[PDB]
Each structure stands twice: as C-alpha cells, then as structure tokens.
Amino acid sequence: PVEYGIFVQRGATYTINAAGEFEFSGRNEKWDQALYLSEHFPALFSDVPLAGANTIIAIMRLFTPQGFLRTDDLAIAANFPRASRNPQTYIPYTNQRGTVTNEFASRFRTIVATLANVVNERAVQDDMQKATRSCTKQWLRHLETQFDNIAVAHTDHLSVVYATMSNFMLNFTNNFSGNHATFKPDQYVITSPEGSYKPIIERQGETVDGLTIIDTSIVWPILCQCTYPLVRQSIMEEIVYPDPSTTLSQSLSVAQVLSKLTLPDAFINMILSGGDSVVMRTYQTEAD
C-alpha cells in the first residue's frame, strides 16, 4: 500500500518529450487501450526507479524480455513487402546450445526467487500456517523445474520458428523493438485530401472471430501440460522442418487476391484524380 502509494502518486502513465526524458502524469487513472495509440505508456513498465517503492520496481523488472532484435535478413533478400525502412523483429529467446545451464530457465528461477520471497513476506504478514506455506513454496519449486524442462524447447527450437516466421512475406510490419519503456508502433494511415484519413491501426472492435482478445492463462498449459520434440525423457523424436511451399503459396495467394481486389476502384480514382476543383472568382483588370 505504501509502495503503491508513492507509485500511483508519481503517475499511472507517462510520455516521452523531445528531450527524451520520461514525464509522468502525477495522476492515478486506469489504462484503456485507446491510449496504446497515443504518446502515453503505462507506468509499471517504465522501469524508472522510484524511491520508497523499489519493491514494485523490482517486480516490474521481472517483466523485462530476454530475447533479441533480429534483422529480417532473408525477407529483405527476397524483396518481401516491409513497411519499415529497416525491417526487424524481436525473437523471445536466443539459442543456447553450449551451456550446462539454460540462461532462460536460470532467469525464470531468479524470478521465482523474488516471487517466492514476496509470497513468504505476504504469508508471514498474514499469519498463515507453516504447512500451507510449505505447499505454495513446493508448488513454486515445482514450476521452477517444469520450466527447467521446457526451456530448451523454447531457446533452441521455438526461437528458430520465430525467426523463419519473421522472414515470411506477409509479416510486413515491425512488431516490437523489445524495449517496453519506449516502444510505439509506427502508425501509417491512408490519408486522402478529399476525405477523412483511415488509420491502418485502431480499436475498431472487429475482434476477428475473437482473435484480438488475449488469454494470458495460456501459459499454464504451455509450461505444465505440453510435450515438445526437443525434450524427450529420451525417445529422440526427429525434428520437423516444414515445406516452405505451403506457407509461401498461401502468402502469394493472399497477395495476388489483394492487388486484383484494389484494381477497379484504383482505376476510376486515377481517371478522376484531376476532377476535384475549387470555386474561383476571376476579377478582370483590363479594359478589354
């Protein structure tokens, strides 16, 4: 409550000036997604240290991504469409073939070190029985080992899938620079002189058969009830490398459908492009 007090008093959100320094709202206010398109960012994810509320700052520093910013090399070689002048994508995790210990599992374990001490603090403050404490602590260790198991299948096998998928023709926009504190997606619009512009990106409420709603709970099945090819314990299932041709052919099909789609409207608009006009008095300044 005190940590949260100093925190929320600093401001629920902030912006970035031309100087580049963060300036906070100083004002408690629930985040709404409209703000995502604006100059505002949520304050927990700012990672500007705050005196007297360091605990929240540490727990928020548990949220920092472990991956890296891959350049979309192959997609550029193949001249696939790309809205950014330098295409890039954030891979969630690096490959780590050599080490005795996965750096990802190690970091998650330190995350559960911090979280476990936070839950022990909360338990002793709230006069809890030692047995129920042993139980939450044991469940925490349990997750730590389960993560130790799947960490290879992520760092070594999902990372490649994120990279090849990074190169696909249709993944044209940049998604994330990997820095939560200052990221803002580039926002192109289809402006018209003769109408209101259409943002490519907005909260239009087309949930796309429910796609845009995000269930975070998906981490539970993923950690704790799904096998991976890379983690046999050891059947040694052979890894699958998918034929490019399927995803390629659907990408290309989407593309040609799109051009042919725009075509008739785009033709007439060219024919009439000079047709917009302004009323104009012509005052005469000569005898004849």
Binding site: R85, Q96, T182
Partner: protein
C-alpha cells in the same frame, strides 16, 4: 601557430592488451584502486551512485552472470550514504576476478587481444556466431594490423557486418542501451563509399568522420532522442577539441572531427548537426550541466538561426539540407591530408565540404553551471535604437525571487561595539545665544522632525540588521563549532548575547563544551538591547582605553535605566558570571524582574548608586517642551549625582538642551564635568538620539560647551518635511529612453530572446542589473535592477540611445545565468559610508547648482569616470580634468561631455579658470593623481591659488572639499575605526593613503586675506534622506555611527563671484 598540429592515434586499439596480459589484466592478485582501476562518486543531491571502471575494462559488456554479482547490487544496499570504500573495493575485486576472457598466449611481439570481440563473446556466453568463433579458435582474437583484426572475423563468418551493443560508461545504470555500433566489412575505401551510400536508405544511423581500428562502424539508434543526445555529446567534444586546435596546441585526440554524420535521422538531428558544425560557442572552462546538453544546443540552433545575417542563415540552411555532408574548416582538411599522407590505407568519411571561409560571427557565451549574472551595463554601444517598443517584464513569483525592505548587515563582530564621541568646542555660553537656540529648540520640538528622516529611522531597524550575524553566532555554538574565545573579549559578549544560557569556562581560553543532553534556546533581544550592550562596552572603553577584557571590575556595580532593559541585564549578568561580586541592577517602567519597575521622575526616597549608569530613558512624547526639558534635566541630574561615570541618552539633542545640561552640571558640581556626545554603532543608524558621556575630572574643563557638533547637527538640520518621502516603487515595463521613473527597482521576467533588448533598454537607468534563468528548461530570464540617479543623469544628456545590444545577443540563451535557488534582493541595499558621503555631498552641491543663474558648464576636476555627474543638469556641458578618466571620444561627443585627460595645474599663472562656469574640486586637493598624500601646506597653496584665479572672473562657483583636523582628536578617542581611521595623525579613507588634514580657522584666515567671498558648507540630514531614498541605499550601522562625525568634519568650501 596557424596550421593545426596533432598526434592522431586510435585510442581504442591502444587500449587493447597483448594476449599474455589477458590472464593478468583482471588482476587476480592485486586489489583494485580508485583513480586507476575505477572511479566512483555519490552525487549526494541526486542520491545516485555513478561507478566508472577505467583502463581496458572501461569498454565492457557484462554477462548476465556478471550482473548477478553483488557489486551491481551495491547501489540497492542504499539509499543513501556513499558506499564505503572497503565494500566497493573488494566487491569490485571479486567481479574483476570473476572475468576469464578466452585467449591464446603467444610469444610474438606484435599481437594485441581483440578486447571488444572477446568481451562481447564472453558477454553472450559464447552462443553468438562470433562468440563460438572465438571459442573454437581463440587465437583469432589476436592481431597485429588493427584493421585485419575484424576482417579475419568477417571472412571467417562470411557475414557482411557485426552489431555490438554498447554499455553505459557508468556501470550501475542497468538500463536500455541508447544505440548499438555496427562494425562493417569495409576494407577498401570504396566498399565504405558503398556502405554509406546504402546507409542513406536506413533509419536512425550515424558515423564518425573516421573510425577506430580503421574499420568502418555505424551507430544505430533505438530512438531519435538517443540519437539527439549522442550527437550532442559529440558536438560538444568536437567543440572542446577545436577550441584548443585553434589555439594551436598539440592534440592527441583520436579523430580530427569528433562530430557525428547523420546518415539517416530526424529533423532535430539535422539541425543539431548543422548548428554543431558552425562552432558558435566561445571557449568556456566553466562546468556544464552535461545532462541538459541537447536542449541547450537546440536552443542555440534556435538562436543562431534566429539572429544571423542572411548569408550565414542561408549557410546553416545549406548545412541542414546536406546533412550527409561533413562540413569542415580548411585547417581540419589540411590535418586530414596530413594523416592520409602518413597512412594511405586509412579510411575517412568521403562526403566533406571544405569551408573556403570561416564564417564571420560572434562567439556565444555558454555557462550552463549555477550562478546569476551581474551585468555591468555600459551607457553607449554599437547599436542605435531609434525607437524601441516598451518591454513589459512579466511579474515574478516570490518563489523565484524575494524583495526584503532592508538589506541585513554583513560585519565583523568587533565592529558592532564601536562608539564615536564628539567633544565640546565653545568656551562660553552668552545669554542671548541661549534665546537664539531656545527658539530653534521650541520650534523643532513643537513642529516635529521630518517624516522622511523618521521613516528611515524606523524602517532600517538595527535588530533586523544585526540578527543574521547574531543568529550565525548561535548556530555555530549549538552544533559545537565554536570552542575558543578569551574571557571578557567582545566575541564572548556576543556569545552571551546569542544564547540564552550560562557560559562556563574550563580554562581562560577554552569554552566549556555544551552539555550533551540539550541545546540552549536563542537569546531574546529587544531592539534597544544591543545598543545597551555597546554602551556598556563604551563605558569600559572610556574608563580606560587599552582594555582587552570588558569584564566588570570586582566589587563594583552598574544600573540600566529605561523600559525593557531586561535582555541587556541578562546578557551582562551571564557575561560577568565569573567575576566575583558583580551587581547588575535594572530599572525603568514596564520592567519585569530582575529589573526594578519605576517611572520617571524617579521616586524621591529612592537612592540608586553605582560606579556606572547607562541611562537610556525614553521620552513620554505626549508632553510640553517645558516638560521634556525639565524631565531630561532631572534625568541627567540623577544620572550624574549617583555615578562617577555616566552615559545618558538624549532623545531631543538641541544645542540648547545639551548646553543647558552642561550648565546644569556646573550648577550642581561647581567644577565642570567632562562631557562628550557619544553615538554607539549598535544604535539604529538613522536615529538622532545621541548619548552624552559624563565624568567629573580634577582639571577644570576648558571649552565646556557644544555648538555645531555633528551629533547635534544630525538633529538640527532635520526640519519639517516639505513633501511626503519617496517610497521605492517596483515598476516592470521598460520604456525606451523615457526619463520618467520613481526611485526604486526594476524586477520582472522576460523571454530570453527579448532579453538582450531588455538589457539594451535597461542600461538607460541602471548601473548594473542581475539576470538569471531558473533552469535550462525555462524560456524566461528573471531580471533585477536598481535605479541609480547618476546613470540617469548620464544617459539623458542627449536623445541618443546607443547600447551594447550586439554583445548581449551572445549571452542568449545559455550565457544568461542559472540558479534554481531563491534570490533575495532588497528595497534598500547596503553601501559603504564614504560613498554615501559622496552622495550627500553631490546632493548638497546639485541642489545649489539648480538655483544659480547663467553658468553654462560644470568643470569637475578630479571627477573620476564621471562620478560627479549627478550634480550636473542635463542642458549643461560637462568637463572633466582627471588624468585617469579613460577617453572614448565617441562618448564625449555623444553625451555632450568633454574630458581633458591631463592633470589640472594648480599654479596661478597656468590656471585656466573661466567666466560662467561651475568648478568642482571634490576630494582632489587631498591627493596627487598617483595617489600620494599632499602635505597640508601644499593644500593651502592649492586653495590659495584657486581663490586667486577666481578673484578675476564673473559667475564662477567652486566647491573644494577638505578634511578638518578636529576630526582626528575625535577619531582617536572613538573605537569605530572601520573604513575611516586615523593613522599617524592623518585621516585614512578606505582604499586610500592617509591624507594630512587642514585646520578650519587657518582656511577661513587664508580665504579672508585673499578677500574672496566664501561659504563653508556641509551636507545635512535632508541631503542624507535625499541620497539614501533616491539611490535605494540604506545606512550601515557602524556607518551610521561614523557618518555624522565624518560628514561635519569634511566641509566643502563654496567660492562664489
């Protein structure tokens, strides 16, 4: 000196160790030390811990295993106290021992480890392709030729380049990196031309004009702001380098042009680079606030473009358009041709534009550090303001600046105890004279003293002046800072007066330490307390002169009459706690115990008695003049019958009052008392309430009576006020060259761009005007200005409005100051007593110069840098004859001034006295131009020759100042020798050699034998009120004490024909 000289070399390749050194470069055996292995500072105000490692380690990307070390957890052991050395040192020793770089030792003498690549390899736990390349073949890191070091990695990996992230130089900032460097394959110059030409198509990318290891690398920015801060820091580096390259000094810096080239960037970067390449800034050793840098430089673009001549403006626009170009001075390119001639393989950024001309523009001042500027504005300059718009200063908060009614004193502790007496002069008191003075007394009493003198008397109250000094004495005591002062010494009395508790002494020299459990409350003084203390000091110093300890003699007593004398008796009693049998009685109406409460006249049965009596009784006010006369008479009678030594206050010191007092003492004792009119320095500066010391002596007192004494003249020349006194207005708008303004000040704030104009207009009225900004963020400059009558009497001699506005333009924006802290200016500032004396003299002369007819000009001999000018009316021509007044003939011609920069000749034959002219001779007779003192006979020769030259001309009026001899015998007796002090019998003004003094009777004698008409005249109290109100000056306390004696004893001679 013309050509640049520099020993260029790649510092980064130099920093890289030979491979055998790598095992020991972590120094496993020896403990790391500050100033070498590292440096750490705790910025106490920001509560931040900055730790920068040094040597090869200074460029190092920490592994996530490296961040898990305690050494990085150290700042979180705090806030707030700085990490003790011993924890930091050893933790650093631990993490430094932890780092084990992969390498291959080799016996060859030409190899150096690729520090960057090996550190980056380790940092990723060797999972990067460059990392595993280092693992399977560590010997690859070794290299001779610096360039091939990265080449062998490029060829081995088959890759076109490599991206290395950069850490903050501070290693306690675990935060997102601003950008990342991208080493490129290069190696021929042509591959570089291609890589850059291609680089124009990217987004937030920049390169240096030359690269380390001769391998091309391009920074890539996460965001335009990070780019802006980088470009800024590097523009600053290039400026600091160029600033000494132009001075011709040898430069060991890595590259000739430390500025970045924006291969692809936002507008703000292009403009930062454009303004950055022009080198607008003047050289500056002042520390900068490095954090606000970008903003500052952007403001500088915002100013440089805002005021440059159209060709310069177009040049900056060209620069802003060809941002990928590297603009550079011819000398720079000459240096590049030198380094290419030396090392042909070297790569350099190709797309440069040489400057055939280094642009002709003023350097801009830039001190981003703390400190308000105090401009000493000049009356005239290059700019001619034919008609300027009124400038409206936006009103100031008191948070940014306050304005107190009066400036508090800043003074030595001994100075506050400084009495200045006046001995009686006349030998007899004829009966008609008593009537003639009685009318002046009854009239001055029944029709009260001037509202202006009384307002000043009651505005600059002495307690408010003394308080910051007396409070500072207290704060050092309670924190234990003081511990040494002699018993009976004035500093001891001051401690007794600064603290409400007993002061024990473990020894005669050492103060007893404050008991550990408590802090004594501050002493409570009423306004008349300190004055009573100074009168006590005056009594011990009048009883005998040489005394060092002001302690009461044993088995002796003293009484202090008057209302609210309690704090005085308390400080006195506790001051004398050590001496045996020291009674210190108190008296007066409204007097709490210890003091007896009694009313004047004292009860007839009561018989007070002591060795000393500091009477200080106040007037009842609501009474007949006969009443105050009989009452003060009985007060002095009782005050004298009881004590051998006395010091009675006189509230209404008429010559008749005081002379009737001496008449009364002779009426009581037979033999005359040895009286003197004392005036304590701790007394209120404008009060005319002088004391009279009284003591019988075995010798008859020749010349018992006073007349025209300075202490009396403070009260006599005060009269009924003609008009209500000027009240210091604080106007904001600055009209251009408009004469009308009240005495007072010019507070306000105004935008920095209109700021130089503000000072260009402010110059018309103000001798100086302090200016500052609250912060680098603020667009406004706060500005304060006193209004001095002299400068107004200089700038308004003509309609011309010249100013140094062009120079003031250089101060915008960073050259105007910065001060987050409050400033407190005063409606009445302090100034030295002698300057005030010159003001009273200049008023006494100026208000006579207006009344006279016909005389066209004022020839003020000795008027250094136009000090005399306030005397002169605006229509009049003004001529100075001082061989020390520097000559600008343009200003002589501009303000209708004429200045003969030759010594004036005092010989009668060569003297060039003229009809219809006013000759000022203010303090010139006392000194030769070199500053040596003139012997009194030579001064008699000077006055004789000037009156002789004046005998033969019409409408001529001279004002020759002279120091009287009778002051010496005064000042020898008085203790207040500050500023004005006797030495070897010659009076010494501050910042002057002592000068021999003339006798007044001898002066009137030579002036009467010459036969010329003459009038001795001295500035009066109304003149004092006039100067102190008009200038905004307030009287000093010791200055207030010394000022009456100092003024009456330096009469001006007024010759007239």
């Amino acid at each position: 000196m013309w050509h640049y000289t520099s020993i260029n070399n790649d510092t980064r390749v130099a920093l890289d160790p030979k491979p055998n050194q790598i095992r020991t470069i972590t120094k496993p055996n020896t403990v790391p030390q500050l100033g070498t292995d590292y440096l750490y500072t705790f910025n106490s105000q920001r509560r931040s811990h900055t730790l920068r490692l040094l040597g090869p380690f200074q460029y190092f990307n920490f592994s996530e295993t490296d961040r898990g070390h305690p050494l990085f957890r150290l700042p979180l052991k705090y806030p707030s106290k700085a990490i003790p050395a011993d924890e930091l040192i050893d933790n650093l020793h631990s993490w430094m021992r932890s780092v084990h770089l992969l390498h291959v030792r080799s016996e060859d003498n030409t190899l150096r480890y690729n520090w960057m690549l090996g550190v980056y390899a380790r940092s990723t736990n060797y999972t990067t392709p460059v990392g595993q390349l280092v693992v399977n073949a560590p010997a690859i890191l070794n290299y001779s030729n610096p360039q091939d070091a990265f080449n062998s990695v490029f060829v081995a990996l088959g890759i076109d380049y490599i991206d290395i992230p950069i850490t903050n130089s501070n290693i306690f900032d675990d935060s997102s990196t601003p950008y990342n460097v991208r080493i490129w394959h290069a190696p021929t110059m042509t591959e570089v031309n291609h890589i850059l030409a291609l680089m124009r198509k990217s987004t937030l990318v920049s390169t240096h004009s030359s690269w380390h290891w001769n391998v091309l690398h391009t920074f890539h920015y996460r965001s335009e702001s990070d780019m802006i801060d980088h470009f800024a820091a590097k523009i600053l580096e290039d400026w600091r380098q160029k600033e000494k390259l132009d001075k011709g000094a040898l430069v060991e810096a890595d590259r000739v042009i430390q500025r970045l080239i924006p291969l692809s960037s936002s507008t703000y970067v292009q403009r930062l680079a454009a303004i950055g390449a022009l080198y607008p800034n003047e050289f500056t050793e002042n520390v900068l606030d490095l954090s606000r840098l970008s903003t500052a430089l952007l403001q500088l673009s915002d100013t440089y473009y805002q005021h440059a001549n159209d060709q310069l403006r177009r040049l900056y626009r060209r620069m802003y358009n060809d941002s990928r170009t590297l603009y550079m001075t011819q000398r720079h390119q000459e240096l590049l041709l030198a380094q290419i001639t030396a090392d042909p393989n070297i790569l350099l950024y190709p797309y440069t534009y040489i400057f055939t001309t280094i642009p002709t523009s003023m350097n801009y001042i830039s001190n981003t550090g703390q400190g308000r500027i105090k401009h000493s504005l000049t009356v005239t300059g290059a700019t001619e303001h034919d008609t300027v718009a009124d400038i409206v200063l936006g009103q100031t908060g008191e948070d940014v600046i306050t304005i107190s009614m009066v400036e508090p004193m800043s003074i030595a502790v001994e100075d506050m105890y400084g009495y200045v007496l006046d001995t009686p002069t006349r030998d007899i008191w004829p009966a008609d004279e008593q009537i003639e003075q009685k009318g002046d007394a009854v009239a001055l009493y029944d029709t009260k003293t001037s509202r202006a003198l009384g307002m000043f008397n009651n505005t600059v109250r002495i307690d408010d002046l003394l308080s910051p000094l007396l409070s500072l004495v207290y704060r050092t005591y309670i924190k234990g800072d003081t511990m040494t002062m002699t018993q009976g010494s004035l500093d001891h009395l001051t401690l007794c007066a600064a603290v409400d508790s007993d002061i024990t002494f473990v020894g005669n020299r050492m103060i007893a330490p404050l008991p550990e459990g408590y802090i004594p409350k501050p002493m409570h003084r009423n306004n008349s307390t300190m004055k009573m203390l100074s009168l006590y000091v005056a009594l011990k110093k009048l009883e005998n002169f040489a005394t060092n300890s002001y302690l009461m003699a044993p088995d002796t007593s003293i009484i202090l009459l008057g209302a609210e004398r309690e704090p005085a008796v308390n400080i006195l009693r506790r001051f004398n706690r050590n001496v045996s049998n020291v009674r210190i009685i108190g008296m007066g109406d409204r007097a709490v115990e210890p003091n007896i409460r009694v009313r004047v006249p004292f009860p007839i049965d009561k018989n007070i008695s002591a060795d000393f009596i500091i009477c200080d009784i106040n007037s009842y006010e609501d009474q007949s003049f006969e009443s105050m006369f009989s009452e003060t008479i009985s007060v002095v009678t009782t005050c004298a019958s009881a004590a051998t030594r006395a010091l009675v206050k006189i509230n209404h010191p008429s010559e008749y009052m005081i002379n009737s007092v001496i008449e009364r003492l002779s009426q009581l004792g037979g033999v005359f008392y040895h009286t003197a009119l004392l005036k304590t320095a701790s007394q209120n500066p404008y009060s005319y309430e002088t004391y009279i010391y009284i003591t019988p002596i075995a010798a008859a007192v020749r010349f018992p009576f006073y007349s025209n004494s300075a202490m009396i003249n403070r009260y006599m020349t005060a009269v009924a006020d003609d008009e209500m006194p000027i009240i210091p207005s604080i106007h904001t708008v600055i009209k251009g060259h408009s004469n009308t303004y009240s005495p007072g000040l010019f507070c306000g704030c105004v935008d920095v761009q209109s700021a130089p104009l503000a000072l260009s207009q402010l110059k018309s009225y103000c001798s100086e005007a302090t200016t500052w900004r609250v912060d680098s963020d603020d667009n406004l400059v706060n500005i304060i200005a006193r209004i001095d009558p002299a400068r107004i009497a200089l700038e308004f001699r003509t309609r011309s409005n010249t100013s140094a506005y062009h120079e003031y333009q250089r101060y915008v924006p960073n050259g105007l100051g910065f001060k987050v802290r409050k400033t407190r200016e005063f409606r009445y500032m302090h100034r030295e007593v002698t300057f005030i004396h010159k003001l009273m003299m200049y008023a006494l002369i100026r208000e006579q110069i207006s009344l006279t007819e016909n005389m066209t000009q004022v020839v003020s001999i000795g008027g250094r840098n136009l000090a005399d000018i306030s005397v002169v009316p605006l229509n009049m021509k003004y001529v100075v004859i001082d061989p020390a007044t520097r000559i600008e003939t343009l200003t002589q011609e501009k303000k209708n001034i004429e200045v003969q920069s030759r010594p004036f000749q005092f010989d009668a034959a060569n003297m060039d006295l003229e009809n219809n002219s006013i000759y000022l001779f203010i303090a010139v007779i006392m000194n030769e131009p070199n500053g040596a003192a003139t012997p009194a006979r030579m001064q008699m020769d000077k006055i004789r020759n000037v009156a002789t030259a004046m005998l033969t001309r019409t409408n001529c009026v001279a004002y020759i100042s002279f120091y009287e001899a009778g002051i010496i015998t005064r000042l020898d007796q008085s203790t207040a020798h500050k500023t004005i002090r006797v030495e070897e019998g010659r009076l010494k003004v501050a910042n002057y050699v002592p000068v021999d003094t003339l006798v007044e009777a001898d002066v009137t004698l030579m002036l009467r034998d010459i036969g010329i008409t003459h009038e001795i005249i001295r500035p009066s109290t109304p003149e004092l009120i006039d100067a102190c109100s008009n200038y905004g000056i307030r009287l000093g306390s010791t200055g207030g004490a010394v000022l009456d004696v100092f003024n009456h004893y330096s009469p001006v001679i007024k010759l007239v024909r």
